[PDB]
Amino acid sequence: YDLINVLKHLQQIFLGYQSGHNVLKFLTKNMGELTKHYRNDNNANYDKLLQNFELERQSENPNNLMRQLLMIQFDTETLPQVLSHYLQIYPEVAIYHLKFDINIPYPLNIIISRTCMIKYQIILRYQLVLQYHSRLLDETWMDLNKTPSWKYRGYSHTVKRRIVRATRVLHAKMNHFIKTIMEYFNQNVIDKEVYSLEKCYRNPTLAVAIQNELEGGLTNIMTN
Amino acid sequence: GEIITLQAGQCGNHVGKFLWSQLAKEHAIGTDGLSQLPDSSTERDDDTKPFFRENSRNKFTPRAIMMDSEPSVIADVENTFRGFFDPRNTWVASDGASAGNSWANGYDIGTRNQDDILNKIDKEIDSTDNFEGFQLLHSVAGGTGSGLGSNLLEALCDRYPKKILTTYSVFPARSSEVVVQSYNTILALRRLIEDSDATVVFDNASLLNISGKVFRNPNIDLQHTNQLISTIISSVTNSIRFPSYMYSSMSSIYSTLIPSPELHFLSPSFTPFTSGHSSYDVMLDLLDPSNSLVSTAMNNPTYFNVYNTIIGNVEPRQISRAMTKLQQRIKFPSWSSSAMHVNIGRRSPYLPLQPNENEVSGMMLSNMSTVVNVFENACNTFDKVFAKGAFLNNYNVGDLFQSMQNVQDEFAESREVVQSLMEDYVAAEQDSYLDDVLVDD
Amino acid sequence: DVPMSQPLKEQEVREHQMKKERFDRALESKL
Numbered sequence: 015y016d017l018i019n020v021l022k023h024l025q026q027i028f029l030g031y032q033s034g035h036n037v038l039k040f041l042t043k044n045m046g047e048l049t050k051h052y053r054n055d056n057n058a059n060y061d062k063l064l065q066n067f068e069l070e071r072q073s074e075n076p077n078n079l080m081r082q083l084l085m086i087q088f089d090t091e092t093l094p095q096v097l098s099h100y101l102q103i104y105p106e107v108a109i110y111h112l113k114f115d116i117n118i119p120y121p122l123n124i125i126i127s128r129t130c131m132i133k134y135q136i137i138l139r140y141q142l143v144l145q146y147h148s149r150l151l152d153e154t155w156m157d158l159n160k161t162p163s164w165k166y167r168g169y170s171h172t173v174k175r176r177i178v179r180a181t182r183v184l185h186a187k188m189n190h191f192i193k194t195i196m197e198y199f200n201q202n203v204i205d206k207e208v209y210s211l212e213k214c215y216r217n218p219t220l221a222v223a224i225q226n227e228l229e230g231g232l233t234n235i236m237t238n
Numbered sequence: 239g240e241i242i243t244l245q246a247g248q249c250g251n252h253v254g255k256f257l258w259s260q261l262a263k264e265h266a267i268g269t270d271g272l273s274q275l276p277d278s279s280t281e282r283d284d285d286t287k288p289f290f291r292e293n294s295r296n297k298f299t300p301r302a303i304m305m306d307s308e309p310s311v312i313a314d315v316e317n318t319f320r321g322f323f324d325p326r327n328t329w330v331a332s333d334g335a336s337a338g339n340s341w342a343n344g345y346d347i348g349t350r351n352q353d354d355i356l357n358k359i360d361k362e363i364d365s366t367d368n369f370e371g372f373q374l375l376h377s378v379a380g381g382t383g384s385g386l387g388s389n390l391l392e393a394l395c396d397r398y399p400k401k402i403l404t405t406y407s408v409f410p411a412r413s414s415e416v417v418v419q420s421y422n423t424i425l426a427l428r429r430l431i432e433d434s435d436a437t438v439v440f441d442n443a444s445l446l447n448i449s450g451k452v453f454r455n456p457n458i459d460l461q462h463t464n465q466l467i468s469t470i471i472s473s474v475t476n477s478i479r480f481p482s483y484m485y486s487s488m489s490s491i492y493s494t495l496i497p498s499p500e501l502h503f504l505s506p507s508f509t510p511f512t513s514g515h516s517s518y519d520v521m522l523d524l525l526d527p528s529n530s531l532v533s534t535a536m537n538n539p540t541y542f543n544v545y546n547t548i549i550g551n552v553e554p555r556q557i558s559r560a561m562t563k564l565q566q567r568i569k570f571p572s573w574s575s576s577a578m579h580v581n582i583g584r585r586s587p588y589l590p591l592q593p594n595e596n597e598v599s600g601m602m603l604s605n606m607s608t609v610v611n612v613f614e615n616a617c618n619t620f621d622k623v624f625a626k627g628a629f630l631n632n633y634n635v636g637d638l639f640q641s642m643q644n645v646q647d648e649f650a651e652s653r654e655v656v657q658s659l660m661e662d663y664v665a666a667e668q669d670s671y672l673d674d675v676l677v678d679d
Numbered sequence: 680d681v682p683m684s685q686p687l688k689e690q691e692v693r694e695h696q697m698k699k700e701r702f703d704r705a706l707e708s709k710l
């Protein structure tokens with residue numbers, strides 16, 4: 015079956031394993047409609063994004079069956095709302111409701127259980143939303159440093175301080191914090207799990223142990 | 239996200255051929271454009287696309303243009319490697335010439351034929367998928383740098399106003415010629431300072447100090463050290479080429495490397511390797527100024543921004559421990575509360591970690607205050623000679639030809655722009671520089 | 680007897696497992 019390639023593909027899909035260019039590719043164009051869905055009704059033109067994704071699936075690798083089987087659905091419930099059922103996660107006392115899933119054939123479905131798919135789905139939504147916001151901030155930085163209105167001269171120190179430097183000081187702090195979180199999540203959480211799984215393929219003796227680790231890692235991520 | 243590299247004269251093209259060779263090796267893509275990988279698989283874990291164009295016959299050439307005023311240099315690379323270059327995208331100067339190693343020379347070639355260099359650049363962009371910012375390498379003072387590299391930045395700003403301009407700057411005159419090259423350096427910096435979005439400086443002393451310790455021929459200076467510098471300038475795209483997740487693009491990295499763009503030049507630090515160990519030590523080893531690329535006496539500098547990518551047999555627990563010197567050793571950005579950022583892994587699979595290896599290598603770069611030692615050399619030199627009448631009156635080409643008045647004004651205004659860069663390096667480390675930004679708000 | 684706590688690692692390990700199970704059970708109960 016080549017389960018290793020299959021799981022590597024699954025990791026490429028939901029954990030962003032070696033997928034930085036794919037997440038940025040996903041955001042490319044799509045961010046334009048993504049910002050509208052929490053500013054619209056459930057009658058929103060979800061189809062436009064779904065078509066963009068379908069078109070990407072047309073322009074796809076013939077062997078990467080895991081991408082071929084990948085689909086996007088929309089919920090009405092955004093991450094913090096759906097996550098309200100988790101005992102450790104507190105609700106607001108709502109931005110994205112985009113979710114991915116995969117239809118798995120029985121030879122694999124017995125491994126790739128619905129429980130792991132749900133965990134993969136929710137983990138990816140976290141990763142995507144964080145990447146989304148991180149990207150908006152990065153593009154904002156480039157807009158700041160490209161746009162002529164942001165490069166004014168000879169007005170006052172009051173404005174150079176209150177508008178330009180103030181923007182850069184806040185922007186940089188926003189950037190340092192959001193990026194450091196992303197770095198943590200990958201470096202000290204996801205990389206460990208991908209690594210652990212690689213360790214478990216070192217001439218494993220038990221199918222179950224592998225299954226337990228797949229679930230193990232997903233929980234380790236979710237309880238972080 | 240495609241990148242096209244613009245290679246200026248001997249600086250750009252020699253390092254370029256050494257780099258494309260290093261990449262030819264890292265991707266097993268071939269110094270002759272023929273993949274070195276077996277045909278046993280149609281799948282890959284890398285991404286050559288952004289730097290190399292794949293042909294219909296699975297042959298490859300780099301996304302690069304060699305600079306036009308120095309056809310003998312262009313020929314050196316195109317003829318030595320050939321199969322791994324595409325000469326049809328190369329512009330050659332309209333007069334087949336370079337009128338001296340000066341700003342006026344290349345600047346005039348550029349302004350006179352701005353449209354022709356752009357037509358070659360623009361046509362290649364149309365053949366690629368989503369062009370990502372321009373990559374330029376040059377000697378700031380030279381004919382292809384102070385002259386044409388300066389013109390390219392101006393040309394690119396108007397033709398491609400929506401794209402990122404990133405450059406590599408190498409050290410200014412290393413000899414008494416500085417009384418001439420420092421003028422070119424300053425005019426060049428005016429353009430680099432006003433037009434680029436980001437850059438970096440590579441000091442001759444490190445090329446040579448490393449040379450003395452790494453080659454068994456310690457008399458090596460700029461040649462051959464070009465390969466050492468090409469392994470240094472690899473860390474810039476490894477996260478793209480051997481893709482990662484954390485920092486996979488230009489717009490996603492520059493906001494982290496230099497939040498305040500006027501101080502556009504980074505200070506690299508790198509441990510050389512052939513083409514020690516622990517994540518803990520490779521990170522810590524790069525805090526030592528002897529591994530820096532702008533070495534000086536300031537063993538206690540302040541920092542505005544520090545970033546590092548470690549590639550190899552990475553251990554996150556060791557990284558956590560290495561962090562102790564972030565807290566103890568980096569003089570804090572009292573003016574902005576920045577902190578160090580990192581990225582990890584993605585060793586080329588075709589140059590894998592060897593059995594029993596736990597070694598790692600990587601690049602630390604920083605926006606450091608005390609980097610004036612690679613700029614003041616020109617600013618505080620050309621001006622004392624300039625004040626007595628410019629020493630470049632034998633380069634009266636184009637704008638310096640049109641009037642002696644332009645000669646003196648271009649040099650003086652450029653010095654003021656450079657002086658702003660020097661003033662900004664210093665002002666930036668003062669707490670009072672930015673505290674008033676949010677207090678009076 | 681001495682009014683003392685049982686060992687700490689064990690207390691934390693139990694907390695980790697209970698937290699992991701709390702999570703897992705949030706899902707096992709429907710899935």
Ligand SMILES: Nc1nc2c(ncn2[C@@H]2O[C@H](COP(=O)(O)OP(=O)(O)O)[C@@H](O)[C@H]2O)c(=O)[nH]1
Pocket residue numbers: 246247248249250252253308338339340376377378379380381382383384408409410411412440442445460461464
């Ligand atoms: N690091 C490095 N510096 C160089 C190299 N070639 C020239 N330089 C430096 O570049 C400056 C002169 O520029 P050069 O490229 O030779 O002149 P150009 O051809 O007119 O652009 C001086 O600071 C030289 O030390 C090289 O291969 N490597």
